[PDB]
Design an enzyme around this catalytic site. Structure first.
Site, mmCIF file in Angstrom:
data_model
loop_
_atom_site.group_PDB
_atom_site.id
_atom_site.type_symbol
_atom_site.label_atom_id
_atom_site.label_comp_id
_atom_site.label_asym_id
_atom_site.label_seq_id
_atom_site.Cartn_x
_atom_site.Cartn_y
_atom_site.Cartn_z
ATOM 1 N N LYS A 24 0.825 -1.203 0.000
ATOM 2 C CA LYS A 24 0.000 0.000 0.000
ATOM 3 C C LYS A 24 0.861 1.256 0.000
ATOM 4 O O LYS A 24 0.556 2.230 -0.699
ATOM 5 C CB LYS A 24 -0.938 -0.008 1.206
ATOM 6 C CG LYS A 24 -1.796 1.238 1.328
ATOM 7 C CD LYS A 24 -2.272 1.448 2.755
ATOM 8 C CE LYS A 24 -2.954 0.206 3.298
ATOM 9 N NZ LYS A 24 -3.213 0.316 4.758
ATOM 10 N N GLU A 57 -2.582 7.160 13.135
ATOM 11 C CA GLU A 57 -1.723 6.081 12.679
ATOM 12 C C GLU A 57 -0.724 5.695 13.756
ATOM 13 O O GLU A 57 -0.385 6.485 14.640
ATOM 14 C CB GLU A 57 -0.962 6.472 11.408
ATOM 15 C CG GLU A 57 -1.825 6.547 10.184
ATOM 16 C CD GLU A 57 -2.356 5.185 9.802
ATOM 17 O OE1 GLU A 57 -1.650 4.179 10.025
ATOM 18 O OE2 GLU A 57 -3.492 5.114 9.308
ATOM 19 N N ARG A 58 -0.266 4.449 13.674
ATOM 20 C CA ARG A 58 0.886 4.034 14.455
ATOM 21 C C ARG A 58 2.080 4.897 14.082
ATOM 22 O O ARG A 58 2.360 5.110 12.900
ATOM 23 C CB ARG A 58 1.188 2.559 14.205
ATOM 24 C CG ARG A 58 -0.019 1.660 14.362
ATOM 25 C CD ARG A 58 0.139 0.368 13.591
ATOM 26 N NE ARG A 58 -0.971 -0.543 13.833
ATOM 27 C CZ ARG A 58 -2.180 -0.408 13.306
ATOM 28 N NH1 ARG A 58 -2.474 0.599 12.500
ATOM 29 N NH2 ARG A 58 -3.118 -1.305 13.595
#
Ligand SMILES: Nc1ncnc2c1ncn2[C@@H]1O[C@H](COP(=O)(O)OP(=O)(O)OP(=O)(O)O)[C@@H](O)[C@H]1O
Ligand SMILES: [Mg+2]
Lengths: 466, 50, 518, 147, 48
Positions: free
Chosen positions: A157, A183-184
């Site tokens: 991705k 997000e992480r």
């Protein structure tokens, strides 16, 4: 224009201002800290007598109940311009990268802006030329449209994002924006920064053509709520110039979640499964600025994480209400060395109708995904019949399906320095012609693995002749 | 028939336009009149109107 | 004759205005929430007035609001415009009117707000009458049994799920399935049927409403269509009042009528593009007003909300004008959760359902109707006698095929009669498949269904059945224009397959089949 | 201090109300003149406050004393915001005139002045939740009649 | 093209607009006292 903090409950700060100088509903509070920096809040509810309830945007683990607060009059002002390009920013627009602060000469724009009026909207949907065969054939984008990838990690991705940025920056002017919402910090940062800095195109790194705004999970709910609007403002600056913008809102769902928390701490009465009552309006105020006007178009390709696997959940449903295309990255395709893991099935797009893309584009896109409509259901039969040794005609269909599945793969320019294979940019007309001619049977002379990583059918032929 | 309707609409638009002119010119007028005198007279009249 | 203007003026100037100062009652905004103001002590305010928020420093316009909650010592006013400008201490004036929308001939081919303000940028709305939003339904004795058919243009709806003028048929489906596509196909098919379509577009994206308006303009359907639009970015008040504005605009057509193509049209068709989004908007409004929630957090009066809206769609009798107002509400279910709260409410309210399933949509049956569960309680009364006479065998054979639907892949190893039934069902299902923006007139549908119910497509293979139709009608459109007119002329005959039309249609079908090869 | 609130507030409000009520009758009096004018049935401090101001001749300001009378046993924050809008910028004597005619609404409550130059003549008086408009209402009413 | 009838009709400054200004501004809006030299010139220059 100076008030005093009254209450502090978590990341919700109540502040009493003078009677005639109450801040507006989306202004910044900008609490000054002792150690030089400031805590910028965002008003959310005017109430009482000069009292405003605001979201912290920060920790609020060192604040008393008497600290002064300096209303900024305007909403959260974010730097917009060519200066804010190739840099990483937080929700407040402060550059969090190693380089220095943004100069005062750069224009600051309000985070909250009115989406374009109805008159400016395009009266006819237009396909967005990405250059990827499977994307431009199975699930075409929309100029000023929304696309969601449903894929985990290790399916490429990030490489797809990098190639989309590179292609839009090469074929068009194509500046890009990336908002990592919830997000992480490991995945979103230092594995997107390094991969895009390493990835290069026309001796220019992808990171040099991309703006980044990162509101990660560690930040308070307000930061994750307004990081998307920060990215929208930064992209809208370039859109006003007429340049085409590609915006990646990574985990738009984490935006919704943020709002939920912001509502729960704001005392708002819960809706559905704990979600905020203002769900549809909050999502609209973000998804309506992503549209194709006459001057320019902000095309968006978002990422959606569904809790468990529930598409019935209010957050995924609200996201899907504003989506134009879905791209389903799969582990099985990725592990088969097919670099673009886009699944030919489960990847839809409302543009795929003969009125917009064209009758030939629709016809071939229905011819393909029909031999795979059964997903080669023959594969189940082959498992207990061995093809009955061979199928009367099905065996051909299996050959065509395998050939086209291999052909969906494409060498990417961003990976050109990794796999040592030049990147191939394939126009939509080339893709439709190649797949149509392959389905006629011109592609019944070449063996498999000759379609493995080649841009056009003509490129496959050159290889067979040589 | 639509041309006749548009003629009627133009007559109505002309009436509205001359109304706008009379109102705007009457706003421009009486400004110097209040400036010269009577500025406090209206204040007193309104205060008595309470 | 300017003297007429001077005489009409200079008289109302002198003796047409009171000019008497008087105390007027206003209110002060004391708390601005997420689009909700409290307005403090604004008395003499009606329960659904549209307060004004007059312009102040830094704001040269006025944002209007609806005074939904008339509490004691507070009036919670839902803001129609943008709440970011209204601050505590702002003055409000109570305009004495409940929300009203312009209506009449002027609003044809124009995109407007739920407040009647144009947003297409083509000029001011020309009108002379304003109809009030939120009026009482026409009444019990005011209506008549639905008899005139609404020609959708899709064979499946127009043959198995009839829609009549005054009937309220629900288009319920799951996400991207074709609900707006079905509504637009219905709207495009009313080109010469003397009906004024209305499209409400509650909560849709600005891009989608723009593309819908572009499609309607491209097909010339924006000369009898009124498009209302309360998009997603707009405040929840606009989305809440959009369908009511649309149905007031439609009630003007139903009661007074408009001159369409030089004919007094008193029939209107209104498409509420998402009542599942109107319900969400009303839920947001209620929860921001802190009204007690219910099931799925919806307020208690949300069944009442859609019930008022849909019960104004009626077929008036000859005494009250003979007008009509067909309603086509659209609902987006989640994972085919028909038992959800809003879908059950609207299903109970409406007179029929058109279930659009994602399984059939993905399979290839692009009009994704599920005839097994889709119903039309008006039924045959909403069909022309021709279609009623021809579609009975269609419905029977389709039901028989559905009973044997598990058997399609085992058709070879079956009884001869069972295989024949399965094959006929497959042919009929392929016949019902239809492209987008290609509505078929009533005579074309009658001809195709007469050719199908009678054993005439049996020799044609299934994958070509659609093509067969797309050719046959073209044949009738060019080679035999008289048979189409003959079918259309006696479509109202009690015994429709009268010998003349029967021989004409038989000869046309035989002539087409003889020349073509499939 | 907390216990004071009810009793002190009631007494101060009663004194303010008595002084305001006796302001019309007891105007330009003296000690004996206001003693015969102002009712002696009021509070022991109220009658003294009514007589002392007139004895020194400050009886005209005695009503203004009533204005401070409630605030002596209150937070003194409930002063009507009597906004006064006038296109002509107002002088200090003009503002004094406006406040002195405006004390008929409560007392000399918090009054704010604005310009709104697009007005012509007149003045907009917004007291609490009642607005009196007398400036451009006539012209726009006329344009409504004309149209 | 016939809409030029509006332009030819509005050329009635003395007939309608001057008297309408005088009446509206003196009798209705303010009191009957309208006495300051230069209102006629102001009306003439504003109408043009
Ligand atoms: N009858 C049809 N013929 C051909 N294509 C169709 C048809 N109906 C739908 N489609 C295809 O499906 C797409 C989605 O259809 P549509 O927009 O009508 O769905 P919807 O149920 O209104 O969805 P949404 O929830 O997104 O508003 C269309 O853009 C078109 O490509
Ligand atoms: Mg839709």
């Amino acid at each position: 224009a100076k008030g005093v903090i009254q209450e502090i409950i978590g990341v919700v700060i109540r502040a009493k201002f003078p009677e005639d100088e109450v801040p507006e509903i989306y202004n910044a509070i900008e609490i000054p800290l002792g150690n030089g920096d400031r805590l910028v809040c965002e008003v959310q509810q005017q109430l009482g007598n000069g009292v405003v309830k605001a979201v912290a945007m920060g920790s609020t683990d060192g604040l008393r109940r008497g600290l002064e607060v300096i209303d900024t009059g305007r909403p959260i002002a974010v730097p917009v311009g060519p200066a804010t390009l190739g840099r990483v920013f937080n929700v407040l627009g402060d550059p969090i990268d190693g380089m220095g602060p943004i100069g005062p000469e750069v224009e600051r724009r309000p985070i909250h802006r009115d989406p374009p009026s109805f008159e400016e909207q395009n009266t006819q949907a237009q396909i967005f030329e990405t250059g990827i065969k499977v994307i431009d054939l199975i699930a075409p984008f929309t100029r000023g449209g929304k696309t969601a990838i449903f894929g985990g990690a290790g399916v490429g991705k990030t490489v797809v994002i990098q190639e989309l940025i590179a292609n839009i920056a090469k074929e068009q002017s194509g500046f890009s924006v990336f908002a990592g919402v919830g997000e992480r910090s490991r995945e979103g940062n230092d594995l997107i920064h390094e991969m895009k800095e390493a990835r290069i195109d026309e001796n220019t790194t992808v990171f040099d053509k991309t703006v980044m705004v990162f509101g990660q999970m560690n930040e308070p709910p307000g930061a994750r709520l307004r990081v998307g609007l920060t990215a929208l403002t930064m992209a809208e600056y370039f859109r006003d110039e007429g340049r085409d913008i590609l915006l990646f809102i990574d985990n738009i769902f984490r935006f919704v979640q943020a709002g939920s928390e912001v509502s729960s701490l704001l005392g708002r009465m819960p809706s559905q499964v704990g979600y905020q009552p203002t769900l549809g309006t909050e999502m609209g105020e973000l998804q309506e600025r992503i549209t194709s006007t006459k001057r320019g178009s902000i095309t968006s390709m978002q990422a959606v994480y569904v809790p468990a696997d529930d598409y019935t959940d209010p957050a995924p449903a609200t996201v899907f209400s504003h989506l134009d295309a879905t791209i389903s990255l799969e582990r099985s395709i990725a592990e088969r060395a097919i670099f673009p893991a886009v699944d030919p099935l489960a990847s839809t797009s409302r543009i795929l109708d003969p009125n917009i893309v064209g009758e030939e584009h629709y016809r071939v896109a229905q011819e393909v995904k029909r031999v795979l409509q059964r997903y080669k259901d023959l594969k189940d039969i082959i498992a207990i019949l061995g093809m009955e040794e061979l199928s009367d005609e099905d065996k051909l269909t299996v050959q065509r399906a395998r050939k086209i599945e291999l052909f969906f793969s494409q060498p990417f320019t961003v990976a050109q320095q990794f796999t040592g294979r030049p990147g191939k940019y394939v126009p939509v007309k080339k893709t439709v012609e190649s797949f149509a001619r392959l389905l006629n049977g011109e592609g019944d002379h070449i063996p498999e693995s000759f379609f493995y990583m080649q841009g056009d059918f003509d490129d496959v032929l050159a290889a067979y002749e040589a | 028939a639509q041309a006749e309707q548009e003629r009627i609409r133009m007559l109505s638009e002309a009436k509205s336009q001359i109304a706008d002119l009379v109102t705007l010119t009457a706003s421009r007028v009486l400004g110097a009149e209040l400036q010269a005198r009577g500025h406090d007279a209206l204040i007193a009249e309104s205060l008595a109107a309470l | 004759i300017t003297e007429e203007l001077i005489a009409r003026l200079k008289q109302g100037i002198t003796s047409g205005v009171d000019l008497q100062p008087r105390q007027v009652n206003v209110g002060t905004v004391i708390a601005v929430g997420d689009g909700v103001a409290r307005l403090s002590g604004l008395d003499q305010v009606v329960a659904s007035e549209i307060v004004e928020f007059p312009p102040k420093a830094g704001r040269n316009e006025s944002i209007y609001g609806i005074a939904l909650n008339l509490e004691q010592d507070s009036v919670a006013a839902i803001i129609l415009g943008d709440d970011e400008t209204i601050e505590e201490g702002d003055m409000v004036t109570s305009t004495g009117r409940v929300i009203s929308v312009p209506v009449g001939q002027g609003l044809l081919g124009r995109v407007v707000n739920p407040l009647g303000q144009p947003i297409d940028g083509k000029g001011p709305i020309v009108y002379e009458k304003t109809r009030p939003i939120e009026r009482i339904a026409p009444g019990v004795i005011t209506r008549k049994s639905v008899d005139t058919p609404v020609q959708t243009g899709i064979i499946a709806i127009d043959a198995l799920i009839p829609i009549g003028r005054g009937q309220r048929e629900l288009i319920i489906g799951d996400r991207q399935t074709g609900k707006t596509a079905v509504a637009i196909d219905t709207i495009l098919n009313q080109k010469g049927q003397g009906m004024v379509c209305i499209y409400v577009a509650i909560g849709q994206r600005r891009a989608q409403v723009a593309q819908v308006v572009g499609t309607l303009e491209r097909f010339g359907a924006m000369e009898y269509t009124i498009v209302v639009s309360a998009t997603a970015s707009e405040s929840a008040a606009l989305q809440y009042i959009a369908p009511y504005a649309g149905c007031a605009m439609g009630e003007e057509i139903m009661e007074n009528g408009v001159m369409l193509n030089g004919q007094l049209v008193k029939d209107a068709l209104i498409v509420y593009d998402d009542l599942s989004k109107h319900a969400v908007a009303y839920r947001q409004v209620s929860l921001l007003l802190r009204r007690p929630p219910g099931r799925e957090a919806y307020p208690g009066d949300v069944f009442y909300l859609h019930s008022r809206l849909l019960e104004r769609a009626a077929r008036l009798n000859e005494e009250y004008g003979g007008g009509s107002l067909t309603a086509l509400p659209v609902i987006e279910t989640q994972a085919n959760d028909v038992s959800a709260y809003i879908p059950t409410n609207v299903i109970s309210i409406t007179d029929g359902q058109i279930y659009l399933e994602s399984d059939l949509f993905n399979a290839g049956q692009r009009p994704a109707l599920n005839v097994g569960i889709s119903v039309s309680r008006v039924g045959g009364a909403a069909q022309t006698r021709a279609m009623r006479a021809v579609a009975g065998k269609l419905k029977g054979e389709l039901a028989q095929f559905r009973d044997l639907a598990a058997f399609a892949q085992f058709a070879s190893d079956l009884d001869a009669t069972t295989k024949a039934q399965i094959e006929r069902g497959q042919r009929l299902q392929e016949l019902l498949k239809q492209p987008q923006y290609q509505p078929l007139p009533v005579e074309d549908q009658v001809a195709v269904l007469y050719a199908a119910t009678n054993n005439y497509l049996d020799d044609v293979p299934v994958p070509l059945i659609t093509k067969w139709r797309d050719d046959f009608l073209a044949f009738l459109r060019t080679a035999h224009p008289e048979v189409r007119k003959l079918i259309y002329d006696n479509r109202l005959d009690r015994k429709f397959p009268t010998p003349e039309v029967k021989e004409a249609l038989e000869a046309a079908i035989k002539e087409f089949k003889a020349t073509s090869n499939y | 201090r907390a216990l004071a609130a009810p009793l002190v507030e009631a007494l101060l409000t009663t004194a303010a109300e008595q002084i305001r009520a006796a302001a019309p009758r007891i105007a330009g009096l003296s000690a004996s003149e206001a003693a015969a004018v102002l009712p002696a049935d009021l509070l022991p401090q109220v009658r003294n406050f009514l007589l002392t101001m007139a004895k020194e001749g400050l009886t005209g300001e005695l009503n203004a004393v009533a204005a401070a009378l409630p605030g002596y046993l209150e937070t003194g924050s409930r002063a009507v915001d009597a906004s006064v809008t006038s296109a002509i910028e107002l002088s200090a004597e003009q503002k004094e005139r406006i406040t002195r005619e405006l004390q008929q609404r409560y007392g000399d409550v918090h009054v704010t002045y604005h310009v709104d130059p697009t007005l012509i003549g007149g003045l907009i008086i917004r007291v609490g939740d009642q607005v009196l408009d007398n400036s451009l209402r006539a012209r726009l009413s006329a344009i409504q009649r004309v149209l």
